[PDB]
């Protein structure tokens, strides 16, 4: 009886039909999202425990960081559109939260150019139909789960992880219990 509704996860009243199998929401302003990236590597360690063909999806949210929240969601869409997530994720986290040198859309663009993306290609992607559509998709997904805070992870649009119901005294025990819950829920 280890896994129970209300302990390591909760159940959505209205499951999201057609949701991605494993969906993470984050913000570059979000302090625990910073640790999920740099210190715990939650996404990498969850991926390791899932079966060969379970796709993970990660979306940025609007509701932290004021005006910059939307600029970052659109920049994350550009990152997804170019496949450069791994080249920009750490510099964006650190520019936002560590050095606090990301204060405008132009500062975000600077991170991409310094990471090797040509400015013209960043701008074309930024203004593209693909990126406009990715932005809407990220917003709909947050609305479909009534998202109120990050970090958050949802499994098959039906179950939401509850990290506060896990053991948080040890980083690596926490990561193990978290990943193991995702695996359990994907098989339900
Ligand atoms: C070892 C370790 C454990 C952790 O355990 C967590 C504790 C809390 C959360 C939730 C959270 O940040 N929020 C804010 C937005 O709304 C939802 C939720 C809330 O507070 O309701 C997530 C994980 C976090 C960091 C480390 C490290 N190093």
Curated annotation (Swiss-Prot):
Entry-linked Pfam families: DSBA
Major location (coarse): periplasm
GO BP terms in the entry: cellular response to antibiotic
CDD domains: DsbA_DsbA
A GO CC term assigned to this protein in UniProt: outer membrane-bounded periplasmic space
Family the entry assigns: Belongs to the thioredoxin family. DsbA subfamily.
Record's protein name: Thiol:disulfide interchange protein DsbA
Biological source species: Escherichia coli (strain K12)
């Amino acid at each position: 009886a280890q896994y129970e509704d209300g302990k390591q996860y909760t159940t959505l009243e209205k499951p999201v039909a057609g949701a991605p199998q494993v969906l993470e929401f984050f913000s570059f302003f979000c302090p625990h999202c910073y640790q999920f990236e740099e210190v715990l590597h939650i996404s990498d360690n969850v991926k390791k425990k899932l079966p060969e063909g379970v796709k993970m999806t990660k979306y940025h949210v609007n509701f932290m960081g004021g005006d910059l929240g939307k600029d970052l969601t659109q920049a994350w869409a550009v990152a997804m559109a170019l496949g450069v997530e791994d080249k920009v994720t750490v510099p964006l986290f650190e520019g936002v939260q560590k050095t606090q040198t990301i204060r405008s859309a132009s500062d975000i663009r600077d991170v991409f150019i310094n990471a090797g993306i040509k400015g013209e290609e960043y701008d074309a992607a930024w203004n593209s139909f693909v990126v406009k559509s990715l932005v809407a998709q990220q917003e709909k997904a947050a609305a479909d789960v009534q998202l109120r805070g990050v970090p958050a992870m949802f499994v098959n649009g039906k179950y939401q992880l509850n990290p506060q119901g896990m053991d948080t005294s040890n980083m690596d025990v926490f990561v193990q219990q978290y990943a193991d819950t995702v695996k359990y829920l994907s098989e339900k």
